[PDB]
Structure formats: C-alpha cells, structure tokens
Write a protein that binds this ligand. Structure first.
Ligand SMILES: *CCC(=O)Nc1cc(F)cc(Cl)c1Nc1ncc(OCc2c(Cl)c(OC)cc(OC)c2Cl)cn1
Length: 270
C-alpha cells in the first residue's frame, strides 16, 4: 500500500494510543520522539481512519500527511512528528497542545474585574499567529479557515495554527473575506481578513463575531462598508489593524509580513 519514508516512519510498537480527542483523532504516548533520549515518552495526537472510511478518505489523509511533510516545521504551527504506514493502519502523528484551542483558552480566562490575561499576553497571542501564518504563506499554504477555534495553545502558552493541510473534508461565513463568500476565491489576502476577525476574538476573550446579526444580514452589512465595532478595552492601534484587515479590496489589506511588524512594534513599545 503506502511506501516507507525513511525520514518520517516511527515504530508502531513505540506508540501507546490513549483517550479519543474527537470522532478519529486519539491522544497517545510516543516513546522516542527525541532521538537524543529515545526512552523518553511524550504526549502526541494521532489522526487515523475509522472502519467505514472509503478509498477517497485514505487519499485525503495521505494528502494531509504529504502536505505537512513538505511545509516543514515552525514554532507556531502544529508540527508533524512521524507516521506509521507499514503492516497496519495509517497513523499521522502531530504535536498535542495541552491547553486546547485559543477560543476556549480565552473564554475560560474571562474574569468575573481584571483577569490573568494582560494586554502584552493578548498582543503576544496575535503576534505568534501572525508569525505562524507568515511561515505557511512562505511555504505557499493558504489556510482558508483561520479562526481562534483552529489555533491551539501549548503548556507554555505558545500559539500553534491547526489544520493548515486539509483536503476537501468537513460554512464559517463570519470569518470569510468577501471575495471568498461571493466569488469562492481564497488567497493569502483572504486569510488576512480572517486574521482581522481572529484579532477581534482575542480582544473579546473569545467573543462570537457580529453579535446577534443573522448570517442573512452579514453580506449586505459588509457591502454597505459596515464592520464590527471596537471591543470594550481594545486600544485604538489594535482596532486600526483589525480595520486594515477588513478593507474590501484585498490588495489594500496588510501582508502577514506587515502584521508581524505592526504587532512587533506594539510589544516593543511595552
Ligand atoms: C495534548 C493533550 C490534550 O488532551 N490536548 C487537548 C485537549 C483538548 F480537550 C482539546 C485539544 Cl484541541 C487538545 N489539544 C490538541 N488536540 C488535537 C491536536 O492535534 C489534532 C491535529 C491537528 Cl491540530 C493537525 O493540524 C496540523 C493535524 C492533525 O493530524 C494530521 C491532527 Cl490529529 C493537537 N492538540
């Protein structure tokens, strides 16, 4: 079936599968993800197919594995760690971020008063996602569904972009740039629009975008040149970034390079 890639194959017998994470992806213990200390265990996540999967379902998982191999590694993406391809079911092994997705992370750290999430820390979350996206962009990866739910948080509060390698497998209208919504055109610039929405998620501590506004009314609100209002405590400089991300014309929005530089300047100024 699948060929042995010497650069990624990991011994099936050295991975002990554990609790499911959603329906399949499973929590596992891998022994020897560090070649330096190959007795050392680490917690990872394993994507595999359920028993009623078609030949097309295999093809899609192979395709995600092969795409992640080629994009390579970065501090701010969920990285490929290894694969089990031989004499058994296909396992794709990736980093497991202990604190879950950025949405639930922020929503659980909502104060009743001041909360344990400072301005610098929130800007830091935004900067780390911009760095992640600038990398994926340099590897010619268009995400297409950048949102706080698709950003995971490690034990050391590092941001890692999830699911940047999906094929055509299971819309989030509120996060989509107009050219996506209307023309089904996805570019790096349309990802910049989604970044602007994510900025707003961060500075509402995981708020739901366009509060109360049925999806039917969003399209005509955007065509009329209306956008989400500045969130309660959001400094203007940050709202200004969000707005730039929400320019109708894609060529008018910032590049991920410019977002990294802008957020860098805010953190240096602190
Ligand atoms: C690590 C321990 C743990 O339980 N972590 C939890 C717990 C939880 F309730 C929610 C989450 Cl999101 C996590 N973290 C976590 N879950 C899954 C995960 O990997 C899934 C995955 C991703 Cl994000 C990507 O993106 C590149 C690809 C693949 O497979 C190709 C998978 Cl399986 C990471 N962290």
């Amino acid at each position: 079936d699948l060929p042995l890639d010497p650069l990624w194959e990991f011994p099936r017998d050295r991975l002990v599968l554990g609790k499911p994470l959603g329906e399949q992806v499973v929590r596992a213990e891998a022994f020897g993800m560090d070649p330096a200390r190959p007795d050392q265990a680490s917690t990872v996540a394993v994507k595999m197919l359920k028993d009623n999967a078609s030949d097309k379902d295999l093809a899609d998982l192979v395709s995600e594995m092969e795409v992640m191999k080629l994009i390579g590694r970065h501090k701010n993406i969920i990285n490929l760690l290894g694969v089990c391809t031989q004499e058994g079911p296909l396992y794709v092994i990736v980093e497991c971020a202990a604190k879950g997705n950025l949405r639930e992370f922020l929503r659980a750290r909502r104060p009743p008063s001041e909360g344990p999430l400072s301005f610098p820390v929130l800007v830091s979350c935004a900067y780390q996602v911009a760095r992640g996206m600038q990398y994926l962009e340099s590897r010619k990866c268009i995400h297409r569904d950048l949102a706080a739910r698709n950003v995971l948080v490690t034990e050391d509060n590092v941001m890692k972009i999830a699911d940047f390698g999906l094929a055509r497998g299971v819309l989030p209208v509120k996060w989509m740039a107009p050219e996506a919504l209307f023309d089904r055109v996805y570019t790096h610039q349309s990802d910049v629009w989604s970044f602007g929405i994510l900025l707003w998620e961060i500075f509402t501590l995981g708020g739901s975008p366009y509060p109360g506004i049925p999806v039917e009314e969003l399209f005509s609100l955007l065509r009329e040149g209306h956008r989400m209002d500045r969130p309660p405590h959001c400094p203007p400089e940050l709202y200004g970034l969000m707005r730039e991300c929400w320019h109708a014309a894609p060529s008018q929005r910032p590049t991920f390079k410019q977002l990294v530089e802008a957020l860098d300047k805010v953190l240096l100024a602190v």
